[PDB]
Amino acid sequence: HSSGHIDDDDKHMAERLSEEEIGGLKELFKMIDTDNSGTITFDELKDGLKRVGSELMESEIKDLMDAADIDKSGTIDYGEFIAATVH
Ligand SMILES: [Ca+2]
Ligand SMILES: [Ca+2]
């Protein structure tokens, strides 16, 4: 409840990007987190492609998890994966 940010589109231009994870935190992020708590962890990460039982190797889940979440917080966020710049 405020009126110092919700008024002109000028302030909406600086609040249209996802800094932490608010971007997908609603639709995608939740649908990704097997916990739906708002935070994904390797242990849960694998459960994504694991339950798929296709032809993947959990070995890539750890090399992908580490490369994804650079915050080394042990937990990956929507804003931690997007950090990927200059590819
Ligand atoms: Ca979780
Ligand atoms: Ca993190």
Short mmCIF file of N, CA and C and ligand atoms in Angstrom, two decimals:
data_model
loop_
_atom_site.label_atom_id
_atom_site.label_comp_id
_atom_site.label_asym_id
_atom_site.label_seq_id
_atom_site.Cartn_x
_atom_site.Cartn_y
_atom_site.Cartn_z
N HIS A 1 0.84 -1.23 0.00
CA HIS A 1 0.00 0.00 0.00
C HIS A 1 0.86 1.26 0.00
N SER A 2 0.94 1.91 -1.15
CA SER A 2 1.73 3.13 -1.29
C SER A 2 1.31 3.92 -2.52
N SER A 3 1.96 5.06 -2.74
CA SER A 3 1.65 5.91 -3.88
C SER A 3 2.90 6.65 -4.36
N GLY A 4 4.06 6.23 -3.85
CA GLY A 4 5.31 6.87 -4.23
C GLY A 4 5.99 6.16 -5.38
N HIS A 5 5.47 4.99 -5.75
CA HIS A 5 6.03 4.21 -6.85
C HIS A 5 4.97 3.90 -7.90
N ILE A 6 3.75 3.66 -7.43
CA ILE A 6 2.64 3.36 -8.33
C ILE A 6 1.90 4.63 -8.74
N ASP A 7 2.32 5.21 -9.86
CA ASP A 7 1.71 6.44 -10.35
C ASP A 7 2.05 6.66 -11.82
N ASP A 8 3.29 7.07 -12.08
CA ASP A 8 3.74 7.31 -13.44
C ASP A 8 4.57 6.13 -13.95
N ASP A 9 4.50 5.89 -15.26
CA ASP A 9 5.23 4.80 -15.88
C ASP A 9 6.74 4.98 -15.69
N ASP A 10 7.15 6.20 -15.37
CA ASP A 10 8.56 6.51 -15.17
C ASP A 10 9.14 5.66 -14.05
N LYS A 11 8.34 5.44 -13.01
CA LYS A 11 8.77 4.64 -11.87
C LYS A 11 8.54 3.15 -12.14
N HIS A 12 7.69 2.86 -13.12
CA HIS A 12 7.38 1.50 -13.49
C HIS A 12 8.47 0.91 -14.38
N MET A 13 9.28 1.78 -14.98
CA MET A 13 10.36 1.34 -15.85
C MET A 13 11.52 0.77 -15.04
N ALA A 14 11.64 1.22 -13.80
CA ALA A 14 12.71 0.76 -12.91
C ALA A 14 12.24 -0.38 -12.02
N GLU A 15 10.96 -0.73 -12.13
CA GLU A 15 10.38 -1.80 -11.33
C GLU A 15 9.70 -2.84 -12.21
N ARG A 16 10.16 -2.95 -13.46
CA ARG A 16 9.59 -3.91 -14.40
C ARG A 16 10.50 -5.13 -14.56
N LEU A 17 11.71 -5.03 -14.04
CA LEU A 17 12.67 -6.13 -14.13
C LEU A 17 12.75 -6.90 -12.82
N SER A 18 13.07 -8.19 -12.92
CA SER A 18 13.17 -9.04 -11.74
C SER A 18 14.60 -9.03 -11.19
N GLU A 19 14.77 -8.38 -10.04
CA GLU A 19 16.08 -8.29 -9.41
C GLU A 19 16.40 -9.56 -8.62
N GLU A 20 15.47 -9.95 -7.74
CA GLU A 20 15.66 -11.14 -6.92
C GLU A 20 15.11 -12.40 -7.61
N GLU A 21 13.80 -12.44 -7.85
CA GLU A 21 13.18 -13.58 -8.52
C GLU A 21 11.69 -13.33 -8.76
N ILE A 22 11.23 -12.16 -8.33
CA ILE A 22 9.82 -11.78 -8.47
C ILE A 22 9.30 -12.04 -9.89
N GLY A 23 10.19 -12.01 -10.87
CA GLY A 23 9.78 -12.24 -12.25
C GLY A 23 9.00 -13.52 -12.43
N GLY A 24 9.66 -14.66 -12.22
CA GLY A 24 8.99 -15.94 -12.36
C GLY A 24 8.48 -16.48 -11.05
N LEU A 25 8.83 -15.80 -9.96
CA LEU A 25 8.43 -16.20 -8.61
C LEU A 25 6.95 -16.57 -8.54
N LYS A 26 6.16 -16.06 -9.49
CA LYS A 26 4.73 -16.32 -9.50
C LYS A 26 4.36 -17.56 -10.32
N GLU A 27 4.59 -17.50 -11.63
CA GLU A 27 4.22 -18.60 -12.53
C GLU A 27 5.31 -19.66 -12.70
N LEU A 28 6.40 -19.28 -13.36
CA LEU A 28 7.49 -20.20 -13.66
C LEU A 28 8.23 -20.71 -12.42
N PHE A 29 8.95 -19.81 -11.76
CA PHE A 29 9.75 -20.16 -10.58
C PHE A 29 9.06 -21.20 -9.69
N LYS A 30 7.80 -20.95 -9.34
CA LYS A 30 7.06 -21.89 -8.50
C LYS A 30 6.90 -23.24 -9.18
N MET A 31 6.53 -23.21 -10.46
CA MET A 31 6.34 -24.42 -11.24
C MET A 31 7.65 -25.19 -11.41
N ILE A 32 8.77 -24.52 -11.12
CA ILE A 32 10.08 -25.15 -11.25
C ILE A 32 10.51 -25.77 -9.93
N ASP A 33 10.38 -24.99 -8.87
CA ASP A 33 10.75 -25.44 -7.54
C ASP A 33 9.86 -26.60 -7.10
N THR A 34 10.45 -27.79 -6.98
CA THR A 34 9.70 -28.96 -6.55
C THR A 34 9.17 -28.73 -5.15
N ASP A 35 9.65 -27.66 -4.52
CA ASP A 35 9.25 -27.30 -3.18
C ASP A 35 8.14 -26.25 -3.21
N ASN A 36 8.08 -25.48 -4.30
CA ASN A 36 7.08 -24.44 -4.44
C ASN A 36 7.15 -23.48 -3.26
N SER A 37 8.29 -23.49 -2.56
CA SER A 37 8.49 -22.61 -1.41
C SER A 37 9.06 -21.28 -1.86
N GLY A 38 9.66 -21.29 -3.05
CA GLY A 38 10.25 -20.08 -3.59
C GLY A 38 11.76 -20.14 -3.65
N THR A 39 12.30 -21.34 -3.47
CA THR A 39 13.74 -21.55 -3.52
C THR A 39 14.05 -22.96 -3.99
N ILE A 40 14.94 -23.08 -4.97
CA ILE A 40 15.31 -24.39 -5.50
C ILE A 40 16.69 -24.81 -5.02
N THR A 41 16.83 -26.09 -4.69
CA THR A 41 18.11 -26.62 -4.23
C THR A 41 18.47 -27.86 -5.03
N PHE A 42 19.76 -28.03 -5.31
CA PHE A 42 20.26 -29.17 -6.07
C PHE A 42 19.49 -30.46 -5.76
N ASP A 43 19.40 -30.80 -4.48
CA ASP A 43 18.69 -32.01 -4.06
C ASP A 43 17.34 -32.09 -4.76
N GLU A 44 16.68 -30.95 -4.87
CA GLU A 44 15.37 -30.86 -5.52
C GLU A 44 15.53 -30.65 -7.02
N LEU A 45 16.61 -29.98 -7.41
CA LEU A 45 16.88 -29.70 -8.82
C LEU A 45 16.82 -30.97 -9.65
N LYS A 46 17.63 -31.95 -9.28
CA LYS A 46 17.68 -33.22 -9.99
C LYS A 46 16.29 -33.83 -10.15
N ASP A 47 15.49 -33.77 -9.09
CA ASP A 47 14.13 -34.31 -9.10
C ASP A 47 13.34 -33.84 -10.32
N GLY A 48 13.83 -32.78 -10.97
CA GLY A 48 13.16 -32.26 -12.14
C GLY A 48 13.35 -33.14 -13.36
N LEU A 49 14.61 -33.36 -13.72
CA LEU A 49 14.95 -34.20 -14.87
C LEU A 49 15.06 -35.66 -14.45
N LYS A 50 15.11 -35.88 -13.14
CA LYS A 50 15.21 -37.23 -12.60
C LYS A 50 13.91 -37.99 -12.81
N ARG A 51 12.81 -37.40 -12.35
CA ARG A 51 11.50 -38.01 -12.49
C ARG A 51 11.17 -38.24 -13.96
N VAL A 52 11.89 -37.54 -14.84
CA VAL A 52 11.67 -37.67 -16.27
C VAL A 52 12.14 -39.03 -16.77
N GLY A 53 13.17 -39.57 -16.12
CA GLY A 53 13.70 -40.87 -16.50
C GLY A 53 13.86 -41.05 -18.00
N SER A 54 14.46 -40.06 -18.65
CA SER A 54 14.66 -40.13 -20.10
C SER A 54 16.01 -40.77 -20.43
N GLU A 55 17.02 -39.93 -20.65
CA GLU A 55 18.36 -40.42 -20.97
C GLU A 55 19.42 -39.46 -20.42
N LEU A 56 19.04 -38.70 -19.40
CA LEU A 56 19.94 -37.74 -18.78
C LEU A 56 20.71 -38.36 -17.63
N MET A 57 21.82 -37.72 -17.28
CA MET A 57 22.66 -38.17 -16.19
C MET A 57 22.70 -37.12 -15.09
N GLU A 58 22.37 -37.54 -13.87
CA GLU A 58 22.35 -36.65 -12.71
C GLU A 58 23.69 -35.94 -12.53
N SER A 59 24.70 -36.37 -13.29
CA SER A 59 26.02 -35.78 -13.21
C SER A 59 26.02 -34.36 -13.77
N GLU A 60 25.10 -34.10 -14.68
CA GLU A 60 24.98 -32.79 -15.29
C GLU A 60 24.15 -31.86 -14.41
N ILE A 61 23.35 -32.46 -13.54
CA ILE A 61 22.50 -31.70 -12.63
C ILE A 61 23.34 -30.94 -11.61
N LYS A 62 24.50 -31.49 -11.26
CA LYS A 62 25.39 -30.84 -10.30
C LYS A 62 26.29 -29.82 -10.99
N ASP A 63 26.71 -30.14 -12.21
CA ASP A 63 27.55 -29.23 -12.98
C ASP A 63 26.72 -28.06 -13.49
N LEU A 64 25.42 -28.29 -13.59
CA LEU A 64 24.49 -27.27 -14.05
C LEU A 64 24.03 -26.42 -12.87
N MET A 65 23.81 -27.08 -11.73
CA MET A 65 23.38 -26.40 -10.51
C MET A 65 24.44 -25.41 -10.04
N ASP A 66 25.70 -25.86 -10.03
CA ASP A 66 26.81 -25.01 -9.60
C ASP A 66 27.00 -23.83 -10.54
N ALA A 67 26.92 -24.09 -11.84
CA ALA A 67 27.09 -23.04 -12.84
C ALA A 67 25.91 -22.08 -12.84
N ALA A 68 24.73 -22.59 -12.50
CA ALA A 68 23.52 -21.78 -12.47
C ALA A 68 23.56 -20.79 -11.30
N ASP A 69 23.59 -21.33 -10.09
CA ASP A 69 23.64 -20.50 -8.89
C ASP A 69 25.08 -20.19 -8.51
N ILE A 70 25.53 -19.00 -8.90
CA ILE A 70 26.89 -18.56 -8.63
C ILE A 70 26.99 -17.95 -7.23
N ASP A 71 25.83 -17.65 -6.65
CA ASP A 71 25.79 -17.06 -5.32
C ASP A 71 26.34 -18.04 -4.28
N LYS A 72 26.65 -19.25 -4.74
CA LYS A 72 27.20 -20.29 -3.87
C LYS A 72 26.47 -20.36 -2.54
N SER A 73 25.19 -19.99 -2.56
CA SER A 73 24.38 -20.02 -1.35
C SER A 73 23.79 -21.41 -1.12
N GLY A 74 24.04 -22.31 -2.07
CA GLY A 74 23.52 -23.66 -1.96
C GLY A 74 22.11 -23.76 -2.50
N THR A 75 21.50 -22.60 -2.74
CA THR A 75 20.14 -22.54 -3.26
C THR A 75 20.08 -21.61 -4.47
N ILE A 76 19.52 -22.11 -5.56
CA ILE A 76 19.41 -21.33 -6.79
C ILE A 76 18.10 -20.55 -6.85
N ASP A 77 18.18 -19.32 -7.34
CA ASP A 77 17.01 -18.47 -7.48
C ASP A 77 16.83 -18.05 -8.93
N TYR A 78 15.64 -17.56 -9.28
CA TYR A 78 15.37 -17.14 -10.65
C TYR A 78 16.29 -16.00 -11.06
N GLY A 79 16.70 -15.19 -10.08
CA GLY A 79 17.58 -14.07 -10.35
C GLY A 79 19.04 -14.47 -10.38
N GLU A 80 19.34 -15.67 -9.89
CA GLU A 80 20.72 -16.15 -9.85
C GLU A 80 21.09 -16.83 -11.16
N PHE A 81 20.10 -17.43 -11.81
CA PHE A 81 20.31 -18.12 -13.07
C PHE A 81 20.37 -17.14 -14.24
N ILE A 82 19.54 -16.10 -14.17
CA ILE A 82 19.49 -15.09 -15.22
C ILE A 82 20.76 -14.25 -15.24
N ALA A 83 21.51 -14.28 -14.14
CA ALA A 83 22.75 -13.52 -14.02
C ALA A 83 23.68 -13.76 -15.20
N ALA A 84 23.46 -14.86 -15.91
CA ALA A 84 24.28 -15.21 -17.07
C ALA A 84 24.29 -14.08 -18.09
N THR A 85 25.43 -13.40 -18.20
CA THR A 85 25.58 -12.29 -19.15
C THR A 85 26.77 -12.53 -20.07
N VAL A 86 26.69 -11.99 -21.28
CA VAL A 86 27.77 -12.14 -22.26
C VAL A 86 28.05 -13.61 -22.53
N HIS A 87 27.28 -14.20 -23.44
CA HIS A 87 27.45 -15.61 -23.79
C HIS A 87 27.76 -15.77 -25.27
CA CA B 1 12.47 -25.27 -1.85
CA CA B 2 21.66 -17.88 -4.36
#
